[PDB]
A and B are shown apart, each in its own frame.
Chain A
Amino acid sequence: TQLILEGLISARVDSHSKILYARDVDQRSTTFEKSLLMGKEFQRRAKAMMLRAAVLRNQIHVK
């Protein structure tokens, strides 16, 4: 468990029968998941930068 937490073993511990199963995940499923996360982050950062133009074009700040 400590090695999995640190890494470089890429394994799953089936403690029911006490069998150590290696993890071989498909690249596509991981790729699609993180691509969707990137798009959500890109949209969120798009909103934030879009918001930043508001306070500068309209001169909004603490007096």
Chain B
Amino acid sequence: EHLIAQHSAIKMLHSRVKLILEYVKASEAGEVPFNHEILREAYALCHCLPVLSTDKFKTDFYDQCNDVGLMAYLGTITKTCNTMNQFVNKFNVLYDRQ
């Protein structure tokens, strides 16, 4: 559901890009030769598309990934020890006494 949820959002944006791309293709052949502030801005948004990142943003982006990634590692350890605890409890009844 989480991935389909982002799949719908990307599809929504993907449909918008198709409309812009088709309009430019039609303008190259027919339509209005220049819709003025629209294609001017549409080009500006294709230039703003590569959001420039500096060293600090990649520093913080990797900072967030490592923090929760460690949290993910802790969650796996917590799940693993519970399975170990269940294994130990079952093993102490399988052959062991007391």
Task: Give the interface size bracket for A toward B.
Answer: 10 to 19
> Given the complex of chains A and B, what is the CA–CA distance between A35 and B66 in angstroms?
12
Does chain A have a CB within 8 A of B81? yes
> Nearest-CB distance from A44 to chain B (Å)?
13
With A46-B80, A46-B84 known as contacts, the answer to whether A56 contacts B91 (CB < 8 A) is yes
Contact of B91 among A35, A42, A53 (CB under 8 A): A53
With A53-B91, A56-B96 known as contacts, the answer to whether A42 contacts B73 (CB < 8 A) is no
Does chain B have a CB within 8 A of A57? yes
User: Do the beta carbons of B95 and A35 come within 8 Å of each other?
Assistant: no
9 A-B pairs with least C-beta separation: A42-B77, A35-B70, A53-B91, A56-B95, A32-B70, A39-B77, A39-B73, A49-B84, A56-B96
